[PDB]
């Protein structure tokens, strides 16, 4: 090694992504013939929900005491 600085360093990174997507689709067709009476109908319906969240943090300290460098890694 042939150059130096002597220091303390702290770095805090926080990234949170949340995404929610919900869809409903429904169709119906109904039909009738009367005069005896007859009734029919049919169609398609579907329902979905998806959601996710992802969060992470990295807090790191390089510097001059185990107690306070841990403390600052916990609590800014």
């Amino acid at each position: 090694i042939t150059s130096g600085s002597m220091g303390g360093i702290y770095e805090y990174i926080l990234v949170i992504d949340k995404a929610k997507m919900e869809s409903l689709g429904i169709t119906s067709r109904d039909i009738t013939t009367c005069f005896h009476c007859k009734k029919f109908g049919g169609g398609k319906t579907e329902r979905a929900r998806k959601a996710m969240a992802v969060e992470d943090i990295i807090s790191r300290v390089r510097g001059g005491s185990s107690g306070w460098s841990g403390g600052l890694a916990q609590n800014r």
Partner: protein, 78 residues
Amino acid sequence: MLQCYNCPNPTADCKTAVNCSSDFDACLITKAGLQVYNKCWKFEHCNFNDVTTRLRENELTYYCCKKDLCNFNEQLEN
């Protein structure tokens, strides 16, 4: 009294023939691919929303008819 097939559980050829309670005025048949239902029913409830709500979940095809025990599997081609 109206009398329809009114099996308690899905039956590809419901034979359980009953008089319906006065709650009912139509004979339902329903087909949903893998299942078939024949019930004492109401012509007002013979609609996709009522049948899909009254059948506990989701989509189906339905038919209803007036005649005694008229609600039988051949009634629906699905």
